[model samples]
Target chain A: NAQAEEFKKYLETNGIKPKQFHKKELIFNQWDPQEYCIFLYDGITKLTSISENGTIMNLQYYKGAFVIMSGFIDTETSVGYYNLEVISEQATAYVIKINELKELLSKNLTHFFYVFQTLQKQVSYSLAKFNDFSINGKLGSICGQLLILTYVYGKETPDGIKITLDNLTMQELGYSAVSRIISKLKQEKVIVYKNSCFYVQNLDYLKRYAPKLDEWFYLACPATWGKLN
Target chain B: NAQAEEFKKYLETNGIKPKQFHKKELIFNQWDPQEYCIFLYDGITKLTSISENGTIMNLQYYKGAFVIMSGFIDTETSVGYYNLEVISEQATAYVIKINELKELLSKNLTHFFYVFQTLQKQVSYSLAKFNDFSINGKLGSICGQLLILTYVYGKETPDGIKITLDNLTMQELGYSSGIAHSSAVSRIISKLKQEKVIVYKNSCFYVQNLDYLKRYAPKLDEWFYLACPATWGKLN
Candidate 1:
């Protein structure tokens, strides 16, 4: 909690103005040298890249995290291959240039530690996803994946937590087997998928199916900590 | 390649000194604040952690990478249960304190980008390993794992590239079923030996056929190349 408060204060002190954008607006492209770190103030952003096979793959869906770039001080290298776009109806982010960020971080050890903690969290999230993919069978791994996505992008409702996977594909899950798994989950009434959206009604069943899902989910998705509504 | 040269020059200009250590010296302990970013100037180091079960698990065997701490600027947080130790007959590293390094980088965008690139490479290496572990069957994934380690820590002789994994265990590979797969791994290793792809001597693996090994490796090994002892001097 103190860490989160410190991060918030750092952003405020840096004079980064929150910018708003509509859905489907391109936020950051992979062609240019990334100069700013973009933090998601609110709403969801989708990170996608065209694979060597020419298929647009989902990299991550971001909410209340460093949505655009992780290390902002790197000026020599471009974005490599990822693109960020707004997926929610409206998205907002705080933007700060790499040079100014370096200046701020260089001023104090606490400032630099804050940046380290941010990137460390990102690394841990990636590692957790890797662990989840290896933890269980295709069906159970998909459950773990969905739970992680839910923690980041899901909204609580009277019936269940609602999540939109309008851009997700079978290939993005790494194979065709996930389609069958999803279909079975739909038939079992654990979740409902319609209009490119998912409503999870039976959290208990999903958790039971993937026993390690919660642990991996919490480790990766820190945005849900102490502040999830 | 040019970027690496620039990085080396930046380090030298910043007044950082190269330090040497004997075998088995503790470079950075888990309980203390890691204040220096250690670049392996020469020789090898072991990155290990004590598992909850009280077994020492080998995390990495570093030959020429940033073997110790990456974000050395983070003084409040300890190394978080990982220890860096010398494994070579003698080990050497380029050491820079966090505050001093930060000051140098703050003076120039190029210097900062150089440091950022270093950390970025580390992240990519970790990602590649994770991908390898999840890519194929247990045996193939383990092959991939060994192949990655060989790339980082293996030494090339006329016979093959020699790598000592005496400290590695089945459990450290991140699977409960590794013990059950030991026989399969041994059989695979024997088959590999027969094919002259790799040979085991003195409990170390010597890879003879790099062409076959590369199939199991990720597409890019730029990090491996840019961080080597041979490349370190050229870059400077």
Candidate 2:
């Protein structure tokens, strides 16, 4: 937090300030030369990409991160092929130019390490997504993704951990069968869905559907975090 | 080339020698703390991982790289969940300890730039793989994966581009089929052959038409451009 605090003042001095964005704002798109690396200071951001089917696929969800939306993987020129959309009520991120950030990274190993570690987080979450789908089928992947969300973003409640399940989340579950599965879980009392959220009434029943949940859990931040929203 | 050649000798001076590995060698595995960062100089290697169904899934392929086999993603005790399997006649790689390499990266910005760019390649390929699979179904993912292989590793031939599945196994291909049965993968490959999309001969797969393969591979055009002959070796 100190390095971010320190860098905050420095970036502001350089006429760069954390800008607040409205919910559903498109932060980055493909074909841009990804000159700026974003550091999410407040609120949640979802890393997603356009599928050929004209739908958005969720790649990652993070609150605190130094990310370029898969920009670091740029091969031709510097354009990356990923998008970042704001998800929280409001989001604030430090849009530091890579060149400007590079200067700080070279001078300060702490900043350099922060970006590197954050990049690692992208790979980790993506791998888990890749793995779960590869190992599980349509139903299994949907359930596995739900468990992943529960572990990574779910917050504690009286009944069980709860995670927001909005329209974007339905698209993330990315299946027509998701509706059927949710209805089944609800009828069986495996989970309670209300207020745009799903509370796992029985995590055990959920695990039976996706055995690989625990292994992939660490990629997002390891086993059901506390109050990360 | 100059920076790589310069870094090569510099790394050797620091007691890190390029080691030649045998074919079918296990270079890196899960739970390994990724103590060493490998700089590939020769031969090919694959970035892979074990699925929950107990099969290896091919994530990426590289002949030259400054790689940690997704080790940079290590969060729990610096251990990542990737496996680097050697897939060439002989692989030559400069293995450097992270502590030793971090010092070089701290001092030399050029070296730092190289590793950073290499890491970027991982995210790009992985993202495309995810996008294609989510957009396309099982067959589409396999076809897209084949197309990715064509771009990254396929060699142009008189008939078409050739990709050798020498080191790769059919069990792994099952994962490419989205965890289908090995027989199911066989059926799909047979269908592709019958459809005249691919030619399987002498253990090498030749693509008759990339356009047909591209049909199944969604949201991967950027990689196709990046993996073109002009930027072939430039990317890795």
Candidate 3:
């Protein structure tokens, strides 16, 4: 939320126009040519990649952030590797052409510096997740992903921050063992199915299984005095 | 190799001192401070991270390139999550303080853009590897990483491409599991050998049938093509 708000304030310095979209809308498709850079103002979004035979791998999910194709910032003629899928009921963003954005970035050095910082964070985040996913095994991968979701959509309902962890999400995370692992977690009361999405009932128990996820879990579940402690 | 060379020229144009390191020396340990921006001139290095139980995951191996901590460009105090180790007989690099580089780069947008492109490549490469490691399963992960080695170090031979897997030592790869462990790697290697996808002769590993091996590495084709660029430029 802070990131989105900060990004919105940052971009408002450049322009006022915003593009709007609704839930289940495809802002951009996978393999689209790197064209425009997106600055999402509000709502949750996901980046997903599918294989030739129709396997979905959830690359990442974000909210209130910049959404450019992976190579848009690097190469001029590269194609996108993901679809910018808006999962919210409605979302708003500003989509600027890549050339124009680069021009503006070159001139707006201060904003460019912040953007570099964001990209740095992006790299570190992926490395951290990869580290956890690899050495920590499938259990850590699934938990780290679930915690990343909470970072974006964890809501206050007085019962340990509710969020979505549906069947599609289970498969999209790309671990065939997800159903069993999640079932084990659910039974342990680390998480529970409530009103369709899962609620993180016990952060401690979940952290036990995914020890490396301590960094991510504590972010959204801030303050030990609060629920999830 | 071109990348490492290009980055060296780019920095030599700025005036910095070179540092020498030996094979097996630790460049930076996992969780070290995000300090100095390194411009590697020659030799091979690797990035690794360990788990709470001291299990190591081989993040990547690099050659002739910029080796900065992942968050060095972003935060002042972000501890690196990788161990930078020299795996070659000897290596050379130029280490520049980040603030100095930042100050120098403020006046050198062309160089700054190159670094930006490097980080961009860094992100894309990591994403591609993680994608492969995540979706391709253990067999694919090991196969994909081995194929990555062939990209840089594959030597042409009449039999096949002779390769010395460095960071990809069957021990390291198998132990790391690409995401599993050594026996898993052993079994996969055995299966590949029986399938004629790879061969071992003259005390060396050879990719005998590359296409067949590629089938074992589904996530690598695009990554090899688009993610790991031989040269960097594209100033819009």
Candidate 4:
């Protein structure tokens, strides 16, 4: 019950004085630069700035413990701000010293904003396929092999790469992550062999209907955070 | 000359205080909490923190305006604070305010420190032979197939992988990067045979070894990094 107070006092002891306000005291108002922004501590706060004709541009959501655009100067009050009312009961807010604004402007922080936005967009869709294609699973199905081959060496035309036979063999090329994909390709009829030549029958299918081929970027979780040690 | 004064004036105008310490004030000292690390705006700072018994446990050289530890508390400090000292500098340091410390703590940081350290321990020196393999323009002397058979697959020795010709023949079973390597193995050996880089003696290779396999890795670089542009470009 006293967790918030304990945490608030903990932070205050470390030099950041946070003033707590109930959701009722919070008002999304017209711009007055000083009253233009508020940091959302407990409840969800949507940072929206209205356009000249009352149109709202939803910029970002601030939840948990974070600052809104308190540092953003309001050039025009015609575009007002709003509390972004929530349907929840436990709405809360926190305010820090306004003089701390100098610290926020020192470096370029917009890069991280854009990077977080990109992660928000990409991670939702890409992680599913990544989990499905991980290992002894169908990572190197016929279509997958075509992807590997097409991505690796340009393309396999009707005529095999007619260099000497020794050049074609992949000895000491890579680990097993690759061999499995080639095997799946043969099963998928994407590849066929005739008269000392290999054929890529459905290179068109792969180039046309394949999934988005972007790798997922993630900071390695601490080993302690991993499921299997 | 005037630049530092101008910056200091700007800070004062912005209600800021500036401090110029010859790099020693920036490093963490024992018995201090990790709240206020230095913000190096310019110049390089060389630092190493020593233990109470004077054993140099960690060694690091930080450049290009870096924070000491991402503002994380070091539990190993003997005096309950940072025990780091400035090793060398033509170093300049700026003090971080309490709010600056808060911001530093707030920012999500990606670090290579522990990962590189773990990798250093996980890997061994005598690891991969191909890391040492290389060849210098004996282009015609080796057939692709024979090079595959001899140099690529000869020393592979199964690794207990249970590879059979039939297992290799059934192309429909599965695809593996290993298969790519296996295919390359046969192809290089076949090429070596045709080009006579090495000759077959009683169905076995009676050939002199070329450059150490360490060179093969660099040679693979042109293919691994360049050929797979779609996948490899984003790897780094």
Q: CA lDDT of B190 in candidate 3?
A: 79
- When sorted by DockQ, best at the front, the candidate numbers are 3, 2, 1, 4
- Candidate 4, residues A1-229, lDDT tens digits: the string is 1333444444455465444444323435435445322344565444443546776443333344433433222111212233343212344654543344323322323322222222222221122122223222344233443443344343334463211222222221121655666666668866655565445666545533333221211111122112211
Off by over 4 Å in 4: A1-7, A10-30, A36-39, A72-89, A96-229, B1-236
CA-based DockQ, model 2: 0.41
Docking quality of model 1: it rates as incorrect
A160: Cα error in model 1, Å:
3.3
Error of 4 at B127 (Å): 48
**What does DockQ give for each predicted structure?**
0.21, 0.41, 0.42, 0.02
Candidate 1, residue A139: lDDT = 67
Task: Rank by lDDT, highest first.
Answer: 3, 2, 1, 4
Top-down TM-score ranking: 3, 2, 1, 4
How much lDDT does candidate 4 score? 0.33
Which window of ten consecutive residues has the lowest lDDT sum in model 3 chain A?
Answer: A216-225
Which sections of candidate 1 miss by over 4 Å?
A1-36, A40-43, A46-57, A67-100, A108-111, A152-158, A164-175, A194-197, A209-213, A216-229, B1-122, B130-144, B164-194, B200-205, B219-236
Q: Comparing 1 and 3 by TM-score, which wins?
A: 3
Off by over 4 Å in 3: A1-16, A155-158, A164-176, A195-197, A216-229, B1-6, B31-34, B164-181, B202-204, B228-236
* Pairs that clash in candidate 1: none
Which one wins by DockQ: 1 or 4? 1
Choose 1 or 2, whichever is better by TM-score: 2
